[PDB]
């Protein structure tokens, strides 16, 4: 398992050698730093803790500075763990760079989907409307809440509520290009989240 | 039980040991076999003369008696003479080969089929249309022989497929 | 396989057995396989 944290920069397109036009997402990943190695002995499981995006001193507090002191690095805005990693191949303070990936590699990309606020059953759950004419007074409503017998609504009757802003993984994306000089990943297709949002790129779990 | 009452005369070069847990080990030329038996079964070895004794005449005990004798009888003959089951390939193009320690069967599929014998069993292939399983344990030989026959069981219209040696395949008329 | 409440020998060669607390008839003739149910 490989992984790296980055920021979503946006989308563009790239022509392949055979002429195909491939849409790509640009992910900017300034070298990550290993902040802590968790072990089965001490922690109960194996994981690597990656810090990304150096935060201004003023914005960092004292507990944060102490935690990153062992790694000998500036405080990091984003800290995440990776499980399933080769523990011995990593050391606290090691920088993880985009060049762990190569063009053509298959990765999973995790992020938080863009928020949509309070959305109805139609938009939020892709339900059907009622008729718009022929006397109908039922247009964007969520449908019958259920049968009479239970004298209550079953759990999981889908209804309006806040939409978006959930963690979402897209699987089996192809790495198109790795720009080591600029710390960029070109991934084929699109990934969850607004621009500048944190993105995690891991080696595909179904590989 | 008639079967359980019988007494097994151990051949000269076979050794039978036990750990007072009814775990009869039986060393011999072909190999060694171990088998834990039901606690309430008196197993006696008096100078190459094995006998099992039932403590009380009762359904459960009567069954275990005959079985324990039967299984012991196989362990002794196993390490001495050993057991073997023969299979026959019938059908045009059906053939068997041995790629090292793996039986390869071309039985009319789009791929070859590979059986890896488990430890303790050997699969000889004298001809291409005759397979021979060999081993010390009678169970394992039967198990492996069944696995091989299962690859292409004999069908009733022409008899094609792996059959046991001298299996009476029930034939039918096609058209 | 015949799955019926009335499992009986159909011919002389049929044998009634009890596997897994279930009455069964096995026979050389495959048409005579029966299991009670």
């Amino acid at each position: 398992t490989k992984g790296i944290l980055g920021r979503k920069i946006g989308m563009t397109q790239v022509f392949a050698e055979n002429g195909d036009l491939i849409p790509v997402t640009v992910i900017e990943a300034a070298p990550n730093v290993v902040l802590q190695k968790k072990t089965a002995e001490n922690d109960g499981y194996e994981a690597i803790q990656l810090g990304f995006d150096d935060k201004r001193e003023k914005l960092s507090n004292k507990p944060e500075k102490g935690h990153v002191a062992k790694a000998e690095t500036a405080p990091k805005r984003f800290v995440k763990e990776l499980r399933g990693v080769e523990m011995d191949a990593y050391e606290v303070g090691q920088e993880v760079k985009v060049e762990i990936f190569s063009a053509g590699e298959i990765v999973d990309v995790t992020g938080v989907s863009k928020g949509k606020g309070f959305q109805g059953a139609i938009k939020r759950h892709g339900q059907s409307r009622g008729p718009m004419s022929h006397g109908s007074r039922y247009h964007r409503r969520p449908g019958s809440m259920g049968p009479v017998d239970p004298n209550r609504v079953f759990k999981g009757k889908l209804l309006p509520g806040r939409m978006g802003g959930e963690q979402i993984t897209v699987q089996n994306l192809e790495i198109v290009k790795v720009d080591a000089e600029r710390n960029l990943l070109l991934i084929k297709g699109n990934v969850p989240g607004a621009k500048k949002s944190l993105i995690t790129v891991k080696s595909a779990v179904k590989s | 039980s008639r079967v359980g009452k019988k007494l097994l005369e151990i051949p000269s070069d076979v050794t039978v040991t036990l750990n007072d847990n009814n775990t009869v080990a039986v060393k011999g030329p072909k190999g060694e076999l171990t088998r834990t038996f039901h606690p309430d079964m008196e197993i006696k070895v008096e100078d190459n003369v094995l006998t099992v004794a039932r403590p009380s005449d009762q359904k459960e005990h009567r069954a275990l008696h005959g079985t324990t004798r039967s299984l012991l009888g196989n362990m002794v003959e196993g390490v001495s003479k050993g057991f073997e089951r023969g299979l026959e390939l019938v059908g045009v193009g059906y053939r068997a080969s041995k790629s090292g320690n793996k039986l390869v069967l071309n039985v009319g599929y789009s791929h070859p089929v590979e059986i890896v014998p488990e430890e303790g069993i050997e699969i000889e292939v004298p001809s291409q249309t005759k397979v021979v399983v060999k081993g010390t344990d009678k169970e394992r030989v039967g198990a492996i022989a069944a696995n091989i026959r299962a690859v292409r069981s004999p069908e009733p219209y022409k008899g094609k497929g792996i059959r046991y040696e001298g299996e009476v395949v029930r034939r039918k008329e096609g058209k | 396989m015949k799955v019926r409440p009335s499992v009986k020998p159909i011919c002389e060669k049929c044998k009634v057995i009890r596997r897994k607390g279930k009455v069964m008839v096995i026979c050389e003739n495959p048409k005579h396989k029966q299991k009670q149910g």
Partner: protein, 122 residues
């Protein structure tokens, strides 16, 4: 995007002038057909004395659409009309001449007779 009730021009000399789409083939709930897809249709307008006659239920392949088709190289092709060609089950056209340009996509779907007959294959 051809669907039920879509009317198409016929781009051949089979005798049908206009057909109405009865059903898009090739999957249970399939809503829309595009260039290269086969549809079941009825002949709504026919040429007098043609092989195909008004009211017949025929199969046709879509050779032109207003929506058009996107290509791997990132280009598109669109036409100003939706046109089809009456076909048999073996994919040969029932007419003898094809009129107007047809899309390159027919070569991928093995409508080779239609492609050869077309005055232009774009």
């Amino acid at each position: 995007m051809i669907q039920q009730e879509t009317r198409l021009k016929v781009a051949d000399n089979s005798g049908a002038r206009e057909v109405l789409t009865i059903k898009v083939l090739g999957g249970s709930g399939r809503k829309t057909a595009n260039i290269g897809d086969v549809i079941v249709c009825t002949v709504k307008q026919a040429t007098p004395g043609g092989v195909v006659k008004k009211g017949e239920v025929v199969k046709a392949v879509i050779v032109r659409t207003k929506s058009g088709a996107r290509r791997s190289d990132g280009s598109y092709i669109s036409f100003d009309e939706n046109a089809c060609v009456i076909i048999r089950d073996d994919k040969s056209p029932r007419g003898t001449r094809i009129f107007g340009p047809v899309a390159r996509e027919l070569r991928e779907n093995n409508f080779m007779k239609i492609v050869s007959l077309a005055p232009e294959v774009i």
